[PDB]
Design a protein around this ligand. Sequence first.
Ligand SMILES: CCCCCCCCCCCCO[C@@H]1O[C@H](CO)[C@@H](O[C@H]2O[C@H](CO)[C@@H](O)[C@H](O)[C@H]2O)[C@H](O)[C@H]1O
Ligand SMILES: CCCCCCCCCCCCO[C@@H]1O[C@H](CO)[C@@H](O[C@H]2O[C@H](CO)[C@@H](O)[C@H](O)[C@H]2O)[C@H](O)[C@H]1O
Ligand SMILES: CCCCCCCCCCCCO[C@@H]1O[C@H](CO)[C@@H](O[C@H]2O[C@H](CO)[C@@H](O)[C@H](O)[C@H]2O)[C@H](O)[C@H]1O
Ligand SMILES: CCCCCCCCCCCCO[C@@H]1O[C@H](CO)[C@@H](O[C@H]2O[C@H](CO)[C@@H](O)[C@H](O)[C@H]2O)[C@H](O)[C@H]1O
Ligand SMILES: CCCCCCCCCCCCO[C@@H]1O[C@H](CO)[C@@H](O[C@H]2O[C@H](CO)[C@@H](O)[C@H](O)[C@H]2O)[C@H](O)[C@H]1O
Lengths: 272, 272, 272, 272, 272
Amino acid sequence: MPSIENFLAYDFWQYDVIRHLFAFSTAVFLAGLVYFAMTARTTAPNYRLSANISAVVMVSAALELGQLWLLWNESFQWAELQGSFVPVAGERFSNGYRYMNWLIDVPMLATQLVVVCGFVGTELRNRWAKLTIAGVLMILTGYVGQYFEPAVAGVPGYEGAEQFWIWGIISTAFFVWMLLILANAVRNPQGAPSDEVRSRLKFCFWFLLATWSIYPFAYAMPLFAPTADGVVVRQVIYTVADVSSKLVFGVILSQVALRRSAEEGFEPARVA
Amino acid sequence: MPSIENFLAYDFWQYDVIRHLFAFSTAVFLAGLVYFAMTARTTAPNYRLSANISAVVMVSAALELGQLWLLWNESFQWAELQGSFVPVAGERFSNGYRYMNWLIDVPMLATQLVVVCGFVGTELRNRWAKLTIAGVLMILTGYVGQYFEPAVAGVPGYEGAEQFWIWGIISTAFFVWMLLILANAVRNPQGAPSDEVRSRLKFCFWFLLATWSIYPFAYAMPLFAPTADGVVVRQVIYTVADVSSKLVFGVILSQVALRRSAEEGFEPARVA
Amino acid sequence: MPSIENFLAYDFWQYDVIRHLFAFSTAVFLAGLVYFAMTARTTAPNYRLSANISAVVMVSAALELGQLWLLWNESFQWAELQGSFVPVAGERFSNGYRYMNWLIDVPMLATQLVVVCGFVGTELRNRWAKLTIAGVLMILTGYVGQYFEPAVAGVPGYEGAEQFWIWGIISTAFFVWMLLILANAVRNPQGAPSDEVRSRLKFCFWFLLATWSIYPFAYAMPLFAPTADGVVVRQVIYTVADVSSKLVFGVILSQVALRRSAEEGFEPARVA
Amino acid sequence: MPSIENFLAYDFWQYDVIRHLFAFSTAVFLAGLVYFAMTARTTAPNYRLSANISAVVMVSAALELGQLWLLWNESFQWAELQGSFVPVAGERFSNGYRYMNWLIDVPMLATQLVVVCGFVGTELRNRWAKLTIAGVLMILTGYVGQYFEPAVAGVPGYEGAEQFWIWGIISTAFFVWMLLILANAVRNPQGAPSDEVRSRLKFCFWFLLATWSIYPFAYAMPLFAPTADGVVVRQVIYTVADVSSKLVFGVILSQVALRRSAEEGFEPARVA
Amino acid sequence: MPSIENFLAYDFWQYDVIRHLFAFSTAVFLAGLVYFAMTARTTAPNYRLSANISAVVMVSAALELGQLWLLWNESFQWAELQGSFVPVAGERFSNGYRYMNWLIDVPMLATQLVVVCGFVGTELRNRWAKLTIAGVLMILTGYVGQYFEPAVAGVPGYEGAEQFWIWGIISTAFFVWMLLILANAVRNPQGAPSDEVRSRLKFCFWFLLATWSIYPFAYAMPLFAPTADGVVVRQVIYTVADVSSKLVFGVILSQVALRRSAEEGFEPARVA
Ligand SMILES: CCCCCCCCCCCCO[C@@H]1O[C@H](CO)[C@@H](O[C@H]2O[C@H](CO)[C@@H](O)[C@H](O)[C@H]2O)[C@H](O)[C@H]1O
Ligand SMILES: CCCCCCCCCCCCO[C@@H]1O[C@H](CO)[C@@H](O[C@H]2O[C@H](CO)[C@@H](O)[C@H](O)[C@H]2O)[C@H](O)[C@H]1O
Ligand SMILES: CCCCCCCCCCCCO[C@@H]1O[C@H](CO)[C@@H](O[C@H]2O[C@H](CO)[C@@H](O)[C@H](O)[C@H]2O)[C@H](O)[C@H]1O
Ligand SMILES: CCCCCCCCCCCCO[C@@H]1O[C@H](CO)[C@@H](O[C@H]2O[C@H](CO)[C@@H](O)[C@H](O)[C@H]2O)[C@H](O)[C@H]1O
Ligand SMILES: CCCCCCCCCCCCO[C@@H]1O[C@H](CO)[C@@H](O[C@H]2O[C@H](CO)[C@@H](O)[C@H](O)[C@H]2O)[C@H](O)[C@H]1O
């Protein structure tokens, strides 16, 4: 079923904000790509995978937000007798372009925190494999459930509201498992981290947890607020969540990765 | 409410100038991106964050101006019985694509001046955090106010002119606070700068202040001149302001960052 | 004859999944391009051709999936009285954009496995030449056969179902020959590989074989399931197959190439 | 007023040549960007600014020609009952997209010749500032004058032919001043150039002068030849002029910059 | 006159093959650009110009094939009552987008063979200048002649078939001269090449000659086969010719350039 966005009309500002947010995020991510590409070398090689992952996540995110921007532009047009942007006939907006890209982002983001905790080899591979499984299942179960949002919002003639709940609850179980895997890594860092590194890893985990927590809220929004102001708020919190979870987290984790690099005597890391 | 631009028609030249300006700026910024990417290494590592920020700002700005270019092309079409470019039916131009990207640019630009003053660590982080707060509030308050510009221009049937003023005045308070934070950094540079560096930092601040000051003028233009010639002038001063605030400032600040690099004996900085 | 996709209508979700998959894959490949570009140097020079090939394959794949994404968007439009995406009049979707790009990917992927087995010079060239011949013939014979899929699916008025079979069976003969060439290389690796390298090469071959095997299934799908749910499943298995055969295989083969690099004392490979 | 191009119809070949020229130039400049990016390091650091400028100019030029290509495609369509490309209703072509980008190119091109003459510091800055002033005024005065070209061509109902002349003549005064600034730099090179360097700098100046001289001709063309064959010739000479002034000049000036690099003992410059 | 392509209709497969070929070639060239950019450094500096030229040619070729792809998509649309792709009203396809880009490719390709033969300085410059003159004249004379192809094919109402012949024959004279210049360079290589290098240079020349020879055939095709199957064959042989002449030749010439690099003791060339 089409997203709740398609069943509304928009004031100039409601539509215009959302197109600005989609455009802002594409730029943040492309700018982040340039920054992570330009600064990766400064990390020691045994942490440089984390640096590289951040560039990969930026590409993924930039295309995710760019496609949403395009589809948002395509899917509505102004009507001057209504003074509203209104759905165009041949096109329907999907908030689910974003889910599929999360299949890249989510396991990568969790993986780079584990890389900086200092896991290597089989132990990195094992943790990567659990997080990827846990991640893909969270995301796929959520993607199914968001196909039922016109139903949960009570748009006449759409049925299957229960499906929204079931798929969300299953999804959230997979979320908890990922948080348990990562909580176990940051509590058990490898390579004799300092107590400062020890602390910065814990902060990275709670930052991860706080920012990832917004996404389940944005999921449930059609239930609370299925209106054009709700759509505006939902796209605002997705934007806060994307920039934090991906770019701000990447900069924070880069700072820990540099401290570890320098503590093990990487000279590029020390000169800065 | 749609921007004042949408309530006018344009002579060939009025429209054509504006599309040229949008296109010119996109090119300046992409060219600036190449230049900052090609010259960053020449800066010492303890100032290279400034170099990197300039590349980030260039990406941000290039996409900001590119989207405006696209929307400007989309939003109007020629009419030969009027010999004017006139608003197309399904699309409305927004001068507010630019505001959202300022959320990247403004705190970054101020941050790179602080990096070159020589702040590091917690002291950099603290200043970055104040400038980001001050910056986002200036920009968000201004963004609200520019949604009221058809009202302030007296386009029949648009109300809320007072909202233009209130949101502008609040915005300007946040501007003053940012200028106070930066004034305190350039007056208190770190790392035993030379008296030449000391002077060049002060010039960077006043350049920043002069160029940033144009933006509040472009804001108030619908009040002074809500006409197609006014729209032309407004887009000319935004263009002067963007190129100065972002690219020319970046080159100037790079020159200070190099002088500091060389004074601390960075050899790449000395060989040039 | 146009692909079976053109003879169906789609529910919102059927269409929307497929456009998400095409978009997801383009992003995976562009992100993979960044990753392979950023990590190639870490491989020793005598294996760096493999690293370079992975970047080449990523470009090829990203454009292949991007074209499909574009054509998928162009080829159908929503109809609200049918609540379906339906074929647009002037455009027809082709699943065969993907075949032509395989002419790059398939011989390159097989070549980089041979490079890492340690063949060099004439022996690399000979094997490259056999695999390229075998590969192009497999792909060209398959491309002919997929022009007959409306016929094999029993779309009224389309004839030549037998042509689907003949061209598929011929294609599969060329597949077997490529698998025989590669099986001979991984069983006869060069340069005194360790027993761990020896094992990792064999795993690379079976991974290659498993993932390449999905493609002949996706070929035969119009025969089993010529429905919109079948089209959905087919595009899901192509997506699993593309990401595995190209990106995941590239990361796995990079790990072997690094182990070999380090065993021969490449210092960048050892520091990580 | 719209450019003279808009008042004509085109044979297949007239239109097709022009779209080919616009496309050819975009490619030359993008290819030039790759070349200047790949070869900049070979120059000594004290001349590397020249190398960098060439990359900047290439980006600028590629976007200038790309936008003209796009607008040329947008602005006309084929009509089979006339067998002509003819102006589309909603769009008008502007030859003035190119002027605005010259604001980047012209002062940069002149600046890089001064860099290679060996000016540095204040003396470079002073000369850059004079050339930028002289350049912007030449270009802005010319841009005004080209808004009067339908008038000078005698398209019925367009007045202000005199404005074409006045703005052209003013523009040309600013041209002469730039040529005087540059003539003074190449006659007074810095850093004890060889007599070969001394000669190569003079050739660079006369090459600059010859190629820049074509642009004032292309300006005056509506006066001589306001026909579709004239439009073809004008776009041919702009293309010769762009490739020469920007790319060929950049390669020539790079050869001088390398000779100077090698004479001062830059080893990368000597090994090649 | 419009190309012969415009006077035909296409079966699904005829059209679909051609759009696949245009798309395949764009990808090969972009992938080739990445490969040549990633491997240039491995060549010794005195041969690195050849490496750089290959990247330049790849950019040129990628845009040439991309524009043809776009125009091919734009110029025809499906008609279900004819089951054919048929010319759209407002657009006409030109096979001559490709000619203009040859102005870059042809003299560059010939130049890089001369660079690897070991010519330098004035002797390189002289040969570059002859090949560029010879090349531009071959290409411009051919470009004129291909404007007469509807005439030579006997499309009713198109006259000037003789012009096809005259311009082709003139063009071919310029071809012979280029082949004579290059034949003289590969027979007289510089820098005491080995007998293996001596042989590999001769093979490069005959490869060049064979692949360049296809282009005059594709020219003459409207004479032999002015049908949709002919158009298919012509675009197949252009595709074989482009990939061979540009990418495969570049890889072959890179192998010679590396052998020469290593023989003169370039260590990066020896380690691989
Ligand atoms: C559209 C993007 C535009 C970017 C173009 C920037 C180049 C413009 C330069 C104008 C000349 C101003 O004056 C001159 O500026 C350059 C560049 O900062 C300075 O150049 C300095 O940095 C460059 C680049 O890191 C070094 O190669 C150079 O050796 C060094 O001196 C000169 O010391 C200064 O005297
Ligand atoms: C949108 C793209 C992202 C832009 C990134 C902007 C980063 C700057 C904002 C944060 C500033 C406050 O926090 C500051 O962050 C920078 C960058 O992480 C840190 O900087 C650290 O990494 C950079 C980059 O590898 C080094 O050049 C620097 O010497 C080092 O200290 C500072 O030690 C920290 O105090
Ligand atoms: C579409 C993009 C082009 C992709 C290019 C892929 C080509 C490789 C497959 C062909 C293999 C044929 O034979 C092989 O070619 C490669 C590439 O020139 C050569 O490779 C040579 O250059 C590469 C790159 O500079 C070096 O890392 C390598 O060590 C060196 O030997 C081999 O010595 C040769 O035996
Ligand atoms: C779409 C982008 C695809 C790339 C994304 C990243 C993929 C990696 C995910 C981690 C997989 C777990 O397995 C892990 O893989 C990485 C990358 O191959 C390996 O990493 C190895 O190569 C990288 C890059 O050359 C080195 O910085 C690292 O030190 C080295 O060990 C680990 O040794 C392995 O245990
Ligand atoms: C399409 C955009 C890009 C086109 C660039 C192609 C350049 C082609 C050059 C044609 C040959 C002319 O003559 C030749 O030029 C090249 C390039 O400047 C010079 O080459 C010089 O610079 C290059 C690149 O920095 C060095 O690798 C080379 O060793 C050095 O000699 C030759 O010394 C000169 O004799």
